[PDB]
Amino acid sequence: TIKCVVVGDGAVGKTCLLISYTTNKFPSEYVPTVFDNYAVTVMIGGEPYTLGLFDTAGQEDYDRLRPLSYPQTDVFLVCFSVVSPSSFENVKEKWVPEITHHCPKTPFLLVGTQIDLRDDPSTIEKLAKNKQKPITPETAEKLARDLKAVKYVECSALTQRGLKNVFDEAILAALE
Amino acid sequence: LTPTERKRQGYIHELIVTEENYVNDLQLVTEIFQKPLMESELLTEKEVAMIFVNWKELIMCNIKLLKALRVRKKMSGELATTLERIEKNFVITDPRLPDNPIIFASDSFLQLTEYSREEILGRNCRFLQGPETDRATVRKIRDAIDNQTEVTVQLINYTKSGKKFWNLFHLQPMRDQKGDVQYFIGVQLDGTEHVRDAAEREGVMLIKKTAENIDEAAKELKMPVKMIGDILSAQLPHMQPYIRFCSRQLNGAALIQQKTDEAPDFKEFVKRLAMDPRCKGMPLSSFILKPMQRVTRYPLIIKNILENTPENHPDHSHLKHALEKAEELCSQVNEGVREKENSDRLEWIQAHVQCEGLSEQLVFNSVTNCLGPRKFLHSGKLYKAKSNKELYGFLFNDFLLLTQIYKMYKTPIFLNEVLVFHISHIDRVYTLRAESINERTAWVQKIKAASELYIETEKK
Numbered sequence A: 001t002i003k004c005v006v007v008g009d010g011a012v013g014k015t016c017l018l019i020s021y022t023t024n025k026f027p028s029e030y031v032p033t034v035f036d037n038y039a040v041t042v043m044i045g046g047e048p049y050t051l052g053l054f055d056t057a058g059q060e061d062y063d064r065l066r067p068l069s070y071p072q073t074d075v076f077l078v079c080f081s082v083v084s085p086s087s088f089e090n091v092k093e094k095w096v097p098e099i100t101h102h103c104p105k106t107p108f109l110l111v112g113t114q115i116d117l118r119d120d121p122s123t124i125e126k127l128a129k130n131k132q133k134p135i136t137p138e139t140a141e142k143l144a145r146d147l148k149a150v151k152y153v154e155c156s157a158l159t160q161r162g163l164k165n166v167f168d169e170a171i172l173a174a175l176e
Numbered sequence B: 001l002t003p004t005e006r007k008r009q010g011y012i013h014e015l016i017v018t019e020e021n022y023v024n025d026l027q028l029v030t031e032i033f034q035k036p037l038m039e040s041e042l043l044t045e046k047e048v049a050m051i052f053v054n055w056k057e058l059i060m061c062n063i064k065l066l067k068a069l070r071v072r073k074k075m076s077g078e079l080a081t082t083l084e085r086i087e088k089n090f091v092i093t094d095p096r097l098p099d100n101p102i103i104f105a106s107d108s109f110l111q112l113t114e115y116s117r118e119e120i121l122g123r124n125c126r127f128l129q130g131p132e133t134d135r136a137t138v139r140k141i142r143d144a145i146d147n148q149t150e151v152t153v154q155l156i157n158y159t160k161s162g163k164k165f166w167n168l169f170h171l172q173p174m175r176d177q178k179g180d181v182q183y184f185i186g187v188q189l190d191g192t193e194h195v196r197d198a199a200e201r202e203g204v205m206l207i208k209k210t211a212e213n214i215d216e217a218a219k220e221l222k223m224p225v226k227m228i229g230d231i232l233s234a235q236l237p238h239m240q241p242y243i244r245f246c247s248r249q250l251n252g253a254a255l256i257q258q259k260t261d262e263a264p265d266f267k268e269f270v271k272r273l274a275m276d277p278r279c280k281g282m283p284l285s286s287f288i289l290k291p292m293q294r295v296t297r298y299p300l301i302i303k304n305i306l307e308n309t310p311e312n313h314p315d316h317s318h319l320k321h322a323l324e325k326a327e328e329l330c331s332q333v334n335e336g337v338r339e340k341e342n343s344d345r346l347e348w349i350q351a352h353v354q355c356e357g358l359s360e361q362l363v364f365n366s367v368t369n370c371l372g373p374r375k376f377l378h379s380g381k382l383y384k385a386k387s388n389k390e391l392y393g394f395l396f397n398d399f400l401l402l403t404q405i406y407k408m409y410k411t412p413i414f415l416n417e418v419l420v421f422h423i424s425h426i427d428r429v430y431t432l433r434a435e436s437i438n439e440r441t442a443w444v445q446k447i448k449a450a451s452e453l454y455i456e457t458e459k460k
């Protein structure tokens, strides 16, 4: 069993990508739930691997409760919304330094989420009003190198684009 | 159903369902982990108490909550089975809720109107009205509701498909013992024409007598209340045991991890316990997170219930106060972890550090001059340059204490007069070698931060 922990700012899409991956469908707004500790078994090259999925949502603003989830973690998922730049800044300013402190031997991926809103005209308008632009993959891949992340991945819990790939690359990182 | 109100019913559903699963998960751990380990005798009574600690106290704490949330949903279940004996067209509405929504619809009403109970509940009965419906008669119904008095009129109502039918409709309030109106009863008697004379007089008596039975068959029963914040606001102040659990759960996880590595029999024994299909393939250690995970997810749930609850809703006053109490609980628990760790560190120092050549009796776990309670920050091996003396320093929020492998080295260096590897105190200059560059970073960053905190607070 490989323990994977998803961390990142609030409302970046941590819970959704976990639900959308495990339930193979994006959470309906009318039927919303939390994400209990879940275990999935995927097949990579004929070899079954078991992921231990953990959701740190609701802990972001609690510094003594957050690291309780960190013990025995095999791989981290540092998340940021490609639309929210402030969540992208807290990656190098908060989350990556925090997991390096608690779990220095634990590998982590750089996960860009909500990539389906990057082309959305309505969303760019709101970002333009604050003189901000959505994080391009080229930008995020630069942060992936500078923070010594294993690699960079993008996903949409809504479109399921590159969603499977995120957890697949997560496993490969925990087998290093 | 508005998208907003539909989300509310979904989040209230989430609260109760996840509570069901959570209380059940608490009881699973006790059954298949705690009790087997107590009998396994691989751990002493103290060692078992170091792991699960007040798990039992958490269960009783949430069962009291779970039963309260269940009773509210049970009210609509007990009522439906009671008013099922009445095979007449009738609905029940709640004036105390926005736009006076249907909180109950009879089976007969659903057959007549061709509607389903899911497409009706939470909406005003005005959807039955249409083109040929006399708007003047409709206003006669509105007045009776505003005037809180009964009424009996005849008007054209329409079905889901649009099939026209006359409605010998009777309305009457449902007053409590105090005398105030709490609900409305609406009886429908479908027809094909506007009944007159003997046909009308008979029909009026029928529907009025019908409403009298509904008022009696549903009396003395605490009616279904469409709100959940009233419970949470009064139940959350009793979630005190969570503060105790999370503060000591860290020592428990480290106890298991230790026992796991230094005993192969223990590791296999615990793994076999987790092979229970009820565990969904999750290890014991992950179940320890659940109490902490539950309190942190209470504000998330309540916040979403609140943001989909209108201002004029009687639940908004409770949900708002409940979210305040919920977020307080997390903070108290969050700080509870910090306080327990601090006490564990300081009490360890109190009975391990000898204080000689000092004027006053140094008590570590006490109050500082301007920062309040003393807090331990950092501690590591420190070698003094040009001397190479094996020293060991304990950094606090108010002062730095240098010891030796514990016998005190020098006078406790306060941080209101310290400077920043090279550490400077007044005139005296200290030169200390760190074990590594990362440790030299840890010292400098924390000493400077603690020094600046003392100074700025002292400058008030």
Ligand SMILES: Cc1cc2nc3c(=O)[nH]c(=O)nc-3n(C[C@H](O)[C@H](O)[C@H](O)COP(=O)(O)O)c2cc1C
Pocket (backbone or CB within 6 Å): B091, B092, B093, B100, B124, B125, B126, B128, B129, B138, B139, B141, B142, B145, B155, B157, B167, B169, B171, B184, B185, B186, B187, B188
């Ligand atoms: C318990 C109850 C049952 C009602 N049943 C009907 C009904 O069957 N047909 C109808 O046209 N109005 C019915 N009404 C009245 C409407 O719900 C609504 O109050 C009325 O049409 C006035 O609408 P307005 O406030 O938009 O003017 C009922 C009202 C109550 C309180």
Ligand SMILES: Nc1nc2c(ncn2[C@@H]2O[C@H](COP(=O)(O)OP(=O)(O)O)[C@@H](O)[C@H]2O)c(=O)[nH]1
Pocket (backbone or CB within 6 Å): A008, A009, A010, A011, A012, A013, A014, A015, A016, A017, A057, A113, A114, A115, A116, A117, A155, A156, A157, A158, A159
């Ligand atoms: N378009 C889009 N929206 C998303 C996606 N993931 C999350 N969201 C939105 O983000 C909101 C909350 O995100 P959430 O999963 O709770 O993030 P978390 O708080 O970090 O766990 C939801 O209302 C979703 O509508 C995504 O992949 N695409």
